[PDB]
Structures are given as structure tokens and as C-alpha cells.
Amino acid sequence: PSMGTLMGVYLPCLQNIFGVILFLRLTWMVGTAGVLQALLIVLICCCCTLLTAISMSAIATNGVVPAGGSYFMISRSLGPEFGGAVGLCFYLGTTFAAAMYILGAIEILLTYIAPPAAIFYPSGAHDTSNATLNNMRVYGTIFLTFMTLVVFVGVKYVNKFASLFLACVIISILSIYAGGIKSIFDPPVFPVCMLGNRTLSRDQFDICAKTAVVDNETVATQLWSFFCHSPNLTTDSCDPYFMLNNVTEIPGIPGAAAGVLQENLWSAYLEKGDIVEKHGLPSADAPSLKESLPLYVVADIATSFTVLVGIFFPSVTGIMAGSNRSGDLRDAQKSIPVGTILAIITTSLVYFSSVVLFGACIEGVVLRDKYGDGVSRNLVVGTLAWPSPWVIVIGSFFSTCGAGLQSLTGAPRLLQAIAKDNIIPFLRVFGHGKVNGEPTWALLLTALIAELGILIASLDMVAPILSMFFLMCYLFVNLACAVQTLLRTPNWRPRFKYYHWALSFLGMSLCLALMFVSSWYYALVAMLIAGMIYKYIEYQGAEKEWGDGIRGLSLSAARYALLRLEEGPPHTKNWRPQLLVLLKLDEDLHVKYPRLLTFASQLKAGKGLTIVGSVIQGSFLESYGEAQAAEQTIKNMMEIEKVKGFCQVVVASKVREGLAHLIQSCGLGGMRHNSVVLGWPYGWRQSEDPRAWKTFIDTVRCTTAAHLALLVPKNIAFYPSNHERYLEGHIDVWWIVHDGGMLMLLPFLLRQHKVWRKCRMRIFTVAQMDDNSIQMKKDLAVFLYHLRLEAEVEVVEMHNSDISAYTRMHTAVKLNEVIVTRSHDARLVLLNMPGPPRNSEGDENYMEFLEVLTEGLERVLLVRGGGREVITIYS
Amino acid sequence: PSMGTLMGVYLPCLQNIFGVILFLRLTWMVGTAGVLQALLIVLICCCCTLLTAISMSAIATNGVVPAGGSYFMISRSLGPEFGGAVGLCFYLGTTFAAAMYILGAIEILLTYIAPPAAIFYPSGAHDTSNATLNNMRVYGTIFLTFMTLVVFVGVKYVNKFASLFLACVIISILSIYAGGIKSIFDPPVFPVCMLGNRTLSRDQFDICAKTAVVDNETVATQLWSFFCHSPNLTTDSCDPYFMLNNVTEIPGIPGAAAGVLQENLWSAYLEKGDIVEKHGLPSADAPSLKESLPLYVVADIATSFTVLVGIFFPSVTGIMAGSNRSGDLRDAQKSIPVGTILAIITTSLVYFSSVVLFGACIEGVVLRDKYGDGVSRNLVVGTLAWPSPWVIVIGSFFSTCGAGLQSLTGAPRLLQAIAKDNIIPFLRVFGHGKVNGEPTWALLLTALIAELGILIASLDMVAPILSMFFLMCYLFVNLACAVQTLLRTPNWRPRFKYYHWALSFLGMSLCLALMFVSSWYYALVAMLIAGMIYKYIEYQGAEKEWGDGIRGLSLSAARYALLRLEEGPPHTKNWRPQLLVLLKLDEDLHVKYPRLLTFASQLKAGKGLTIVGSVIQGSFLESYGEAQAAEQTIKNMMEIEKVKGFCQVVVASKVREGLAHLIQSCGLGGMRHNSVVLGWPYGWRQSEDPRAWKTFIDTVRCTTAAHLALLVPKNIAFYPSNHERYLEGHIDVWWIVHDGGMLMLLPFLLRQHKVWRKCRMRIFTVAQMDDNSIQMKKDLAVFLYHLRLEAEVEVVEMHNSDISAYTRMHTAVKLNEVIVTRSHDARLVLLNMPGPPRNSEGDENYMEFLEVLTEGLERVLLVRGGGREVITIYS
Ligand SMILES: *[C@@H]1O[C@H](CO)[C@@H](O[C@@H]2O[C@H](CO)[C@@H](O)[C@H](O)[C@H]2NC(C)=O)[C@H](O)[C@H]1NC(C)=O
Ligand SMILES: *[C@@H]1O[C@H](CO)[C@@H](O[C@@H]2O[C@H](CO)[C@@H](O)[C@H](O)[C@H]2NC(C)=O)[C@H](O)[C@H]1NC(C)=O
Ligand SMILES: *[C@@H]1O[C@H](CO)[C@@H](O[C@@H]2O[C@H](CO)[C@@H](O)[C@H](O)[C@H]2NC(C)=O)[C@H](O)[C@H]1NC(C)=O
Ligand SMILES: *[C@@H]1O[C@H](CO)[C@@H](O[C@@H]2O[C@H](CO)[C@@H](O)[C@H](O)[C@H]2NC(C)=O)[C@H](O)[C@H]1NC(C)=O
Ligand SMILES: [K+]
Numbered sequence A, B: 001p002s003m004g005t006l007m008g009v010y011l012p013c014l015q016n017i018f019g020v021i022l023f024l025r026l027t028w029m030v031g032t033a034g035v036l037q038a039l040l041i042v043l044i045c046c047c048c049t050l051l052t053a054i055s056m057s058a059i060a061t062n063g064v065v066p067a068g069g070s071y072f073m074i075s076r077s078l079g080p081e082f083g084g085a086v087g088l089c090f091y092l093g094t095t096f097a098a099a100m101y102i103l104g105a106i107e108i109l110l111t112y113i114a115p116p117a118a119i120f121y122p123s124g125a126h127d128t129s130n131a132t133l134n135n136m137r138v139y140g141t142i143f144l145t146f147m148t149l150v151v152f153v154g155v156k157y158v159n160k161f162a163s164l165f166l167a168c169v170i171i172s173i174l175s176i177y178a179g180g181i182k183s184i185f186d187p188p189v190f191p192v193c194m195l196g197n198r199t200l201s202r203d204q205f206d207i208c209a210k211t212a213v214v215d216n217e218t219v220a221t222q223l224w225s226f227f228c229h230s231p232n233l234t235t236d237s238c239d240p241y242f243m244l245n246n247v248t249e250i251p252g253i254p255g256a257a258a259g260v261l262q263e264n265l266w267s268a269y270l271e272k273g274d275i276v277e278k279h280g281l282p283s284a285d286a287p288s289l290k291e292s293l294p295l296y297v298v299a300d301i302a303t304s305f306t307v308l309v310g311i312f313f314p315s316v317t318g319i320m321a322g323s324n325r326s327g328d329l330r331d332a333q334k335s336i337p338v339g340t341i342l343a344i345i346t347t348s349l350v351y352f353s354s355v356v357l358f359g360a361c362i363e364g365v366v367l368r369d370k371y372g373d374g375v376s377r378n379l380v381v382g383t384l385a386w387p388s389p390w391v392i393v394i395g396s397f398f399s400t401c402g403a404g405l406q407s408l409t410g411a412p413r414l415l416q417a418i419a420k421d422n423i424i425p426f427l428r429v430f431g432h433g434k435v436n437g438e439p440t441w442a443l444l445l446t447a448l449i450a451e452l453g454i455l456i457a458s459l460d461m462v463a464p465i466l467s468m469f470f471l472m473c474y475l476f477v478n479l480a481c482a483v484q485t486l487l488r489t490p491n492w493r494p495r496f497k498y499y500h501w502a503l504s505f506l507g508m509s510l511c512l513a514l515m516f517v518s519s520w521y522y523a524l525v526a527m528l529i530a531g532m533i534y535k536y537i538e539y540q541g542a543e544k545e546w547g548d549g550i551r552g553l554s555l556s557a558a559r560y561a562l563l564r565l566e567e568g569p570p571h572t573k574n575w576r577p578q579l580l581v582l583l584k585l586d587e588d589l590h591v592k593y594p595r596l597l598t599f600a601s602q603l604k605a606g607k608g609l610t611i612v613g614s615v616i617q618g619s620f621l622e623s624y625g626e627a628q629a630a631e632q633t634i635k636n637m638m639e640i641e642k643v644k645g646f647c648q649v650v651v652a653s654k655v656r657e658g659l660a661h662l663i664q665s666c667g668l669g670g671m672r673h674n675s676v677v678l679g680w681p682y683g684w685r686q687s688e689d690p691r692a693w694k695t696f697i698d699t700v701r702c703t704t705a706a707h708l709a710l711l712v713p714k715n716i717a718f719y720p721s722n723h724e725r726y727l728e729g730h731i732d733v734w735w736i737v738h739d740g741g742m743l744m745l746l747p748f749l750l751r752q753h754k755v756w757r758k759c760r761m762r763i764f765t766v767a768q769m770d771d772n773s774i775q776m777k778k779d780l781a782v783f784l785y786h787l788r789l790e791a792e793v794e795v796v797e798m799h800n801s802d803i804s805a806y807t808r809m810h811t812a813v814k815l816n817e818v819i820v821t822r823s824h825d826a827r828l829v830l831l832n833m834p835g836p837p838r839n840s841e842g843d844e845n846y847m848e849f850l851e852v853l854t855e856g857l858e859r860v861l862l863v864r865g866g867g868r869e870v871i872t873i874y875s
């Protein structure tokens, strides 16, 4: 591990991000859309790329930066899914970028260097735009096969050629800028011929004039014959437009001044078939024939803001190239982000400055002319260069061929990596390699896809697909980062100093909008294939890890949610009850109190969680069938009571030991239960053995030991069935000094049912004789009215000296008289359960008085909190 | 509950589905696109509607069909979510349908019945198409407020007017078809004026001729003056086109023959500003001035297939109207589907037949003329009617006004219902109602939205928005049905005889494509708002049911997945191991064998679930802190071993009782554990108490009683840490007569780790002397090669007479000698664990001899299945 930061990540990213659009389709961009819109487009693309770089840096800061490429980092940081989709998108982008590079190199070879090097000439104006496409296809396939053979046998020569090509691009840029600086003092002389208001083409004729002077006489020029098909100057059978307008010679490079910048500062789009047009030149109007149109210059494609953005976008892709040597950096956590960001910044600055230079040095005629038709078949960008345009042409050609080489040697690499990681089946056969490791069948697949792309044979028509794939990958990386940060995933801590999920969300939205505005059907199909591959990967993973069923990807979801649930710290406010239900089974293996199940169902109304549990005496090794039958019958009984939950039965030797074990064993980590529901012991005096009720008390102690809310309804046989409706009544809630957090909440949560909806609460808190409640009543009423739940509230009590719940037998009947006289007709009574016996011997007399505390009442529901259970909403 | 099927669901659905597009913009559809394309569009729309009807019928067959409207049915059948989104989409669709109906009524009143009833006249050709829009806005707002007041005070009159309007529509259709039949014998005389190839407008001038005969002389007509601005026939200062063509009187209704159908059988689109043209009429070519263009007929909008589909789609919406009276049908499960399907079928048949009639009776000129400009300002559809066009005009006007009334009285209904169900907060204030129940502020909201829609003031520009909302609702209902069926959700049993999830998926795809092809930005914004409201509803539900945190919607997901997990029947093939880990804690509350955790981590490699458990002796009521500390320290220790799972600690009085309870208590319903991992007792002879090892044996019995796979590694101290890598070795697997299902699977699952990846399996199954294994070796090799996992396989054994695992002490050493000689150098040894002791007294000597099977060996991993455990992949 020994590599610098400039040599490790800066230079490779710089050479990858720079491309051929800068040398072929940037002056056209500035000319056809104006300086302001050009800067706007560059700014938008730079913004999405920079936000994606921020997200990539956040990814690269997390973890330990596993060695090997850039796909491995994303896969390790974002799970097995979100890696296959982005991997395939990147692969398709690389394999189409190779084809685009081949097409650009072929174009440079054909229209600039050696025009005679053509197979099928486009003879005649008829069917002009087919021979060029056929030549493109032929040369593309020949170059593709030759370069596949070149990258087959040897690769290290290509490896050093990479630095060669970077040097070529650098010298090209410096040449351009030196020429731009020289343009201040004295510009090069590259005249352009002008006819009326439109522009001619100088490649065919020689002199830009109507009539010339030869042999001491005035004679019509070659332009006269080529435009009027009449070698006699007296004929008038040609276009009236030529005889109605008059010719000039405009300097192709006027210099770098303010006026030239002001002239072409505004947008001027065009439609296919129109003529690139000057703005400030005088000209009359007249019709024209159809034979003269071939001897003009014409826009080859309809131009628009969206189309221009789509064409320009590939000129900024290549951000993720600064991770191919991730296993070699001396400092992985630091070098990658700063290097990537600096590379993006310097490319953006060069783009801005070059756009301004083109706007302020070349007029709107040359810039709006692809292929340099208006200027002697010459490259427009090379007109500015200092020594000569040929250095620019050679540098562009070498850089384009080299970029094709790296793309074609890089796509099989990640295809083989994805294949060897074994997440998609057929990639397994697509994965085999040579003895050293160089791919041997994936190269054929990428060659076939590159040939398919070349078959289109149009540089402008291929760039949008490249843009779609790269934008789609960027959308997934941004979305993954944003969601992972927001929803608290474990093992995701991007300790980067300038990261925020809002930035990732904003970049996602911005260049999602870019992806859709550019082309909606390509975006739609890309999204469909990405979603399909994501779901297929998820299904394969579920089949592999789990029992290989259609239920696997539900078990996976449950496990993933339960693992997410561990990161958060418990607990905040807004306490809600979660119920554990304890039942007793008759000697005939049948339930005893289904009304308790009905009550538990109507309290939660099908929300939250409920775990019904039971205990069967006996050994486990000889009573498995009994437990298996009891679980099934409890499951059947729960279905008819409209309660949704889970069941559990544990065979044990001691029933109280089984209950104690069930107290904290039910539920998984974080998915626990919050409260316990247990019944009342009926006829304990009838039974002679204390064990009929002592176990009861024991359970309470455990519920106090585990800090769990305890609910013990009494007279469950009188509780209403799930069918009997109620039309009128009053639910009394006798709040006392403590545990008021939920005593005012249970009526609110229970009101949301078809049974008790008609009733109204009658909270009747005690008014101790020590201090009156004139203002306390107002404060409590204000607190109730501030919350959603509100009802009649009063303050009344008979005595305060008696110490019942202060920290004591007469105080039981003393309050019982008031309760019975004031709440005899109430439908239901919420009441605070007292504390457990102080010592072990205090149990008996305990059971002595709680029942006379509820003697005479029909229905009571004793409640104790024994925990923290703070509440904020509603209550 | 007493209602028929024709009066309950057929007639209301028929009345709702028929609209104003049929009477205003259907002849235009047939004229501008041709019969074939019209039939194709109608077929596509009918297909999506019919598939949505199939899905709706499947929904209506499930459950008990809860009473009240149609929103309640969807909400009950598809959960609280997917109901709010579709509810809001339906509400917006209805409140824009009201505006569209108002606009259609305004147009009918303005351009057909009383032209003078205008406020802002469009004087002059300048700014012509804005005064009409202003008139539309003024009349729209005045009738909006008037109709809001009408539906405010009284509604019963509107209720009977509904049947009135249905009768009006029926009589209108009957009149149209009677006129179509009459067209066979003798057609009505409605001449159209023709100039050359283009068509004039008869509303302004009177006679369609060049020069008339008056006062026994030849005098130029009013057309001469209105088209040449010269009351003298000798002038020639007007359009040359008029002087080079002719004038004819083409019959506007030629009859119903084959030739007329053939003439307009092909598509003919047009662009905005163009003139409708006859196809077979001869005419010369000449230029024209700009003063004559106003005295022609012009297409008011650019026409295309997509635009025409978008305009036509609202003419089929209204399927869900056959569920408003759901709480009153005599038979809910049967009447709704058949009635809805029959209504859709009869509407489709009427649409097809009327399209064919229009194609085969009316020429392509007037059909392509909106507002009937070419025929005396007359409605085109009313030209065919038997008595007179006025009956059609009156019926259309009354039907449109009534449709607006029902839309405006229906939207507040479901708005109030959604508000009262309390799923979105501000709907609470939007929900207040009068004493009877009629809404009082929701009506204000829908009135404002309808006013906003009318502000557009264009019938064609409003229909696509309705189409988008209705299609979005249909997309959600179809997607919900398809996913609900596929993922085996509980409480979803659509017992309909003609339902299949493939149909719902196909309809979803088809009119998702419709929604996107019509307009992509409207579709995008609709999807964004639907997704946002869905997520907001989910978040609010999580906050309400759960502890009101950002973790709520993860608990909800876990619960929902575990509830889905119960429906499926266990278990299919492809057994996979799920581990429960048993640990012993030192007296100093510290772990003993972290190497066991490392082994459990490398065996699963972060897949499946792992539930570590422990047991602490003592009472629970006084040892809570010990358990709380032990759980935390085990959680800390698990993190460094790269194992992901859950922990559980249970305080108990008997350690073996705690283990027995932990056997089946860990995990929830369906999220259970499949196998148990327990260590080996070291130095049992050193200990005098049998409980040091007897408990061990006891655990095995429980694992046999619960039918759970048992794994007991020996010499765990020598097992490698997850850091020490291995370069060479051999993992011996000594398979025996039984339990071969996973003995060949454990090496395959364990191979996928960075430590054991270098090793290779050496399966060495026994070759009993009873029968050779020459062909059995070939069969086993074929079975291995068929699966992914394969390795060296041999057959060897020293004797077969000895009965070791047949159902016995010398047979231990007899096999031990062979094992030690043939597998001494192996890295790891997989071996089949024998059966438990036959009786209780057979435990001791049991522990006597198993160890001689492992005597001398370094690492052994004894395995027993004790279950079913069938495997299909790989193995
Ligand atoms: C030749 O180019 C210029 C500008 O189009 C014209 O030549 C002279 O300049 C003015 C400006 O148009 C003309 O109106 C004069 O008639 C020209 N002659 C002078 C000033 O002596 C002229 O318009 C062009 N030639 C033709 C035939 O159009
Ligand atoms: C260039 O000069 C011509 C006059 O020779 C300008 O006039 C346009 O001529 C074309 C051809 O008939 C018309 O279609 C346009 O409508 C004319 N433009 C008008 C009338 O504004 C032409 O605009 C000039 N081009 C520029 C200034 O870019
Ligand atoms: C209608 O008749 C005209 C001749 O009066 C046909 O000719 C068209 O004329 C316009 C106006 O100049 C041209 O733009 C078209 O190109 C002509 N079409 C031809 C020559 O085929 C016109 O086609 C007729 N339209 C029909 C039959 O639909
Ligand atoms: C307009 O009408 C005249 C009618 O005279 C057409 O002239 C045709 O040729 C001679 C000369 O009048 C007549 O005998 C024919 O009967 C005329 N009609 C036909 C169909 O041949 C003239 O061709 C018409 N111009 C059109 C249709 O553009
Ligand atoms: K690039």
C-alpha cells in the first residue's frame, strides 16, 4: 500500500472525465443556444455530478474501504441489492461509451483527416444521408474487431498509452488556451464567404465573389456557374435571391472583444432543414429553386434545450473512475473525496472559461456549423489553436481511440467481477476467465453489445442512452444514501464533515428531473429494467439464504426490520400499551375465559401486538402432542374473537416457573411486549390450598420486578360479548395521586370500538380535605381540553387523613363507601391497583382487603403502571 | 335490505357511465381518426375498464361487503392505506368532472340554443378566442354558485331528477338510432356548401352559388361581396383561388351505403390552423389573402392519436358508481359484479354500433367540423335524429346539468366520509357536518376546486386531468389486487369464478401505458402526489398505533411480514439450517467459549437468523440487574465476532429447566429456529456430580423430542479464529447409512467463507462388506455432479457385521481405528452422531463410548438430524 493522492486518484479521474464532446460538440453547443443557456446547462450538470460526488464521498468514508474497484465498495456499503442494478447500469454505460468513442474516432478520421478514405461514396444529392451511415457502420465494425484483438493479446502497452493520451489531452487544452490568449492581439485569418444573409460553403468553389477580373477583362466566377448553371453572365434563369442580394467576406475570427461577445450572447435555436443564419446583415427577400439548396449549409438535426442537454451530459460522466485503484491508496479515507471533488471543480472551471472564450472569440456563424462546412472543411476548435489545427486534430484522435481502448478493457472487468460474485445465474457462465485472470467470454458479450450500438451509426443518437444509464446509476446511489441515512440503518456511519441527507435528496430530485426531461420513454424502460433486476436479485437472495420459497423475501424483510430496530435508543414519550395475555387451560385441554380474549381484542381493536401464552404442567419429553394440540386450539379460538397475534405454549414442571419464564421470553429483540393481562382468582376462600391464589400474587411481583404495567379485570364473566352493543352509560375513572399517565388514556384507546363508542367518560379524581381543588379543577379541565380527549371532571373526596396509597384497613371501606355510592350505575370502573405486599408474609391479608376494595361493584379493571410510561399525545 | 339487481346496480351504473362526450365530441372522434382507429381506441379503453371491473368484482366477492358507499369496501379489503390515495384521486376526479359538465352545459347553451345570450362579444377577427373563454368563465362561475345553492337547501328533488335525466338519455339514444334506421330509405336534406376542395360556413351568407338570377338579370351573390369585397362582378382584386375553382352543394347526409363507409374509412389527422378538406373533389391550386380565411372553417386544436384518446377516455369512466347503494342490495355478493359487467358490455356495444353508424352515414367533412360550423350552426349528432335535432339538444342539456348536479352532490359525500374516518389531520376540520348529515364546509372546498377547474374554460383541456386521476385510481386498485393475490396475504380470499392475478397485472400494465402515453408530466405529478399521500398515511398510522416514533413504520413492517408468514403451509423442500446458540457463563459473569461464537459466525456468514441464549441460576425477583448486565455484555461480545442476531437471557431456578424452556420459546410464530448448537462437556470424569454432564444428555433428549437438528462440536478450543486463514487441507465427511441430507450440505454452506475456501471435500462413505459399491460410487458421483457441489468420493469399510447404527461396544473401536488411520491429517471431520440412550439408565455408558469415536482426533463436529429435512438445491 504505497500511492500518492495526485497520482492515485486525481490524474485517472481527470483523464476519464475529459472526453470527445469537448472537441466535437461544445462550440456547436455555445453557438446554437447562447452563452447564458450554455452556462445554465453546464451548471445543472455540474450540480448533479457534485452532489453525486458528495454521496460517493460519504460512502467512501464509511467502513474500511474494501479493496478492489468501485463496485465492491458500493456493494459492501449498500448491501447485495443496489449493487447489481448499479453494476449493470455502469456496465451498459461503459459498453455504449466504447461505441460512441469508436464513432467519434471514425468521424474524425473521415471528415477531417482523409476524406478519400471512404468505401461507399455519397454520389449525388439523392439519398445523401445513407452512404455516410454505411461508412460509419463498416469502419465501426472493423475498428471494433481490430481493437478487440488488440486488447485481447496485450494490455500493458495500452496501460502506458493511457498516460500518453492524458498528456495529449493536456497539450491540446494548453494549445487551445494559448491560441485564445493570442487572439487578443492579432487573430488568424480564416475568412468565411457570405451571400446576402445566409452563409455558403467554401469546400467546393475557391473565390468568394460574384464576378472576377481575368485576362484584363471581367468574367463570371466559378460561383456564377455553380449557382446559376449558366456560363454566360447575361443569363437570368437562376435563383432571384442571388440577384437580389450581394456578397461579403466576414472574418471567421474577429478577436476577443466586448462587441463580439454581445453579438452572440442570446439564444438562437433552429429546425431541421433550415440554414444557419447571421443576425445583423442586410438582405432582401426572394424565392429560390431546389438545385441551389445543396450548395448551402444546413442544420443536420432539430435543436432544442432538452436535446442539447442530452448531447452534452456524457461530457461530465466518469466521476466513479477515481476508485479503480482503491486497494492501493496510502490513505483511502482521505484521498478519494478531496481528489474527486477537486477534479470535478477544475473540469467545471475549464468548461466555464472555455465556453466564455468560444462565446467571445468566434461569431455565431462558425460556432453553429458542425463539421466546419462553412470554413474549408476545417475543425472549428482547431481554428483558435496556436501552431495549427492539426495538433488539435491529432490530439483529439489519439485521445478518442485511447478512451475507446480503456472503455473496452474496463467493461469486461466489472462484468467478470459481478459474475464471480455469483448473484445472477447466467453470469456464472458469462464469468470464466483465462489463466492470468483476463476475461475470455465476457469480452465477446461486450463486443456484441458495442457492435449493436455502433449499428446506429450516429454520435448524437447514442449519447442520450449513455446519459440514461449513468443518470439511472446516480439516481440509485443518491436514493440509497438518502434512505439509508434517514431511516437509521445499522452499520451506516458516513463520518464525512460535509455530508447531509438533504443534499443527496436534492441531487436525486434534480437529475431525476434531468433524466425525465431529456427523454421519458428511455427513462421509463431503464427504470423498468432496473426495478426488475432489483426484484430478481432480492428473490434469488431470499431463495438462497432462506428455505428457498416465495415466503423467503418476507422472512428477510422481517429480519431486516428487526435488525434496524436495534439502533434506536428507547424510549421516547407517547407510551402505547402492548399486551401479553395469560390464560389457564381446563383439565380437558380447553380454554376457560374467552371473554378475556374478547376484551383484549376490543381494547386494541386489531392494532399493535398481542401474544397469547399458556402453561401446561408435566414433562416436555413426553407431552409434545398436548402442546401441539393446545397451540392449534388456541389459534382456532383466537380467529373467531377478531384478535390478530401470535401464540406460544411452554410445557413446564412448575406453573409459576413457566409464567415467570414467559414474562420476559416472549418476543424478539426490540419487538417485545409492554404490558401483561392476567385474570382474577375466583373463589379462593372455597379452595383450601393457598397455591390457587398465591401463584397469582407471585406473578404480580414479577410484573413489578420487570417494570411492566399490570391489568387485572375483575368479574370477567359479566364483561360484554363482542356482539352486544351499548347505547348509553358512563365509564367511571377514579384517578388517584399516582399513575395518571394512562388512566386517562385507556378510555381514549378503548373508545374506538363499536361497543363502547356511545359511552362518555366521567373522570372523578379525589379532592383531599388537606387542600381544595377550586383552581386544580380548572387546571385539569384546561389540560383535558388542550388534548383531544375531554369529558366531565369533578373533585370530591370524603377524607384525606387516612393513608391508603401514601406509602391501613379502615381506609379501604372508607373509600369503598364513596365509590359505591357515587359510581354504582357506571358501566365500567377504572381504578388504581394498590402496591404489592411489603414482605412475603403480607400476602394473605393483602388478598383480604383488595376484594372488599371492590366489593359490591359489578365491573372493575384494576390498573398499575410500575414503570416510566410517559405520554405526550394525545392524551 | 330489499333491492333488486336491475334497479340497484344496473340502472345507476348505466346512468353514470353515459356522459356528454357521446353527444358532443364523438362524431369528431370518428371523423378525424377514421373508423378503424376509433374502434381501436374504444377497444383499448373498454379493455382497461373491463379488467378493472374484474378486479372490483374480485374485491366485492371477498369479505362480507361492508355497507356504505364504495370507498369503505376498498378500504376494508385493502387496508387503511391504498384507500386514502384512491379516495383522494376519486374525489379530485369527481370535482373536476363537475367542472367539465358545467363547461359542456355552457357550450351547449351558448353555441346551439341562444347565441345572443352572451356578455362579452368577440367583435372582430382580432382576439376572437378569448372573449368566448371569458364568457365561459363568467357563466361557469354564476352557474357554479347557483347550483351550489340549489344542492345546499334541497336534494330530494335532485334525487328524482336523476331518474328523469336517465330517461332523457335513453330517449335521446333511441331517437338517434331511429334516425339512423330511417337513413336507409330516405335521408334528411342538410346541404353543405363546397368551394373547390375546402368547405365554407353557411351561418353568415344564405345561397351557395357563384352568381344568382334576380330581376330577370344575372347579379353577383352575397358570397361574391363577402369573399371579394367588390359589389361589381367585373372586379378581379380578390383571391385567385376563388376565380380558379367551383361551388357545389354536397348532401350532408347521403344515406347508409357501402361507398360512403369506404370513403371515410381511413385516418386523416390535421394541424391547428388548417382547413378541413374533402378527399375526392377536383380543385386547382392558387394563393389566397388573409381577409378570406375568417370566412372558412378551421380546426381549433391540433389532432393526434394520443390527444384523441385523452379526450375520449372520460366517456367510459363511472364504473365504481355501481357500489354507492352497496348497503341496500338484497344479494351483495352476486348483484354487483354481473350488473357492472353487463353495464360495461352494453355501453361498449352501443359505442361500437354508433361509431360504425356515424362512419357509414355521415361524410368526413361535417364529422370533422366541431360546433357544426359548416351546417347552419347546427349540432352534428342531431342531424340524424328522427323528429328534429332539438330533442337531442334538450336531452343533452338536461343530462349534462343533471350529471353536474350528481357530481357536485357526490364529491362532498366521500370527502366527509374520509374526513370522519380520521386518517388525515386537517380533514378533521374539513369534516364538520350539519344536523342531518349533509356537509357544510367540504362543499366549500369542492366548490373552490371546481371554480379553479372552470377557470381554464376549455372542455378539451380539462378531460385529460379527469382521465389521469381515474386511471391513477384504477392503477392502484389493480396493483393492490395483483400483489395481494401473489404474496399470499391473510384475509384475502376473492372467491370469484373468473378471477386471476394475471388479468389484474395485464390491465394495470395496459392502462398504465395509457396514462403515460396520454401525458407524461401530468402522470408524473399524479404519481408523486399519490406516493406522498400514501407515505404520509403510513407514517400517521405508525405514529398512532405504535410508540409514535420514526421507528413505528419498521415495527409495523415486521408485524405485517410475520402475519403474512402464517398463511403458508410448512414446509416445502430445500432445508436450510437456522441456529440457536447455547452458552454457559462463568461465575464472574463472563463468557467461556467465544470460539463457539466465531464458529457460528463463519458457518452462517451473516445469513439467516441466530439467537444466542443463556441461563442464570437464581430467583428472578432479586437478580434483574445480573440479567440486564449479561445481556449487554453478550451483545458487546457478539459485535466483535461479526455475527448478527438477537440475544435472550432467562433467570431460572433449574438450569436444565431454563434450557428446556429456551428450546421452543425463542422466536415468534413462523420466525422460529431450526437447529440447536451446544458445546461438549470437558473433563466430566474430573467432576464428581453427574449434573455437570447429565444435563448435557438431557438437552439432547429435548432436541430429539422437538425434532430439531443437533450439532455438537468437540475440542472447540482448537477451532480457528476468523483471522487465521487456511491455504491447504481436506474436510473429511464420513457419511453413514442415515442423515445424508445435510452432511453433504454443511461443507457447501461453510465453504463460502474466507477461512475454509481453500479446502476441498473428501466424502468417504462406507462400503459395507455385505454389498460392493462399484455402481453405487458411480451413482453417488452422478448425483454430486448433477448438483453444484462435487468432490472426491470413495467407498471403503473394514466390516459390516458389526451393528453400530443399525438400531455394541466393539463396533466403536472397530470403526475408530479405520477413521483415525484414514483421516488423521484432515482439517475437520464431519461425523454422524449416534442415537440417544435407549432408557434412562443407559446414559452413563453412553458417555463412555461416543468419545472413543472421537478419541485421537483433533477436530470433530458430530451431527444428528432427528427430523425430516428434505433438500432439493443444491445440494
Ligand atoms: C452590394 O452590397 C451593398 C450592401 O448590400 C450595396 O452596395 C451599395 O450600398 C448601399 C447599401 O445597400 C446600396 O443601397 C447602394 O445602392 C450601393 N451603391 C453605392 C452606395 O454606391 C448593394 O445593395 C449591394 N448590391 C446589390 C446589387 O444589391
Ligand atoms: C436575414 O435576412 C432576411 C431578408 O433577406 C430576413 O428576412 C426573413 O426572410 C425569410 C425568407 O423569406 C422569412 O421567412 C422571414 O420571415 C424573414 N424575417 C422577417 C420578415 O423578420 C431574415 O430574418 C434575416 N435573418 C436573420 C436576421 O437572422
Ligand atoms: C384539396 O385540393 C387541393 C387542390 O385544390 C389539393 O392540392 C393541395 O394544395 C395545397 C395548397 O397549395 C398543397 O399544400 C398540397 O401539397 C396539395 N396537395 C397535393 C398536390 O396533393 C389538396 O391535396 C386536396 N386535399 C385533399 C384531397 O385532402
Ligand atoms: C369547374 O366547373 C367547370 C364546369 O364548366 C369544369 O369544366 C369541366 O370541363 C368542361 C368545360 O366546362 C365541361 O364540359 C365539364 O363538364 C366540366 N367538368 C368536368 C368534371 O369535367 C371545371 O373543370 C371545374 N373546375 C374544377 C372542378 O376544378
Ligand atoms: K466522459
Ligand SMILES: [K+]
Residues within 6 Å of the ligand: B016, B017, B018, B019, B314, B315, B316, B317, B318
Ligand atoms: K362518464
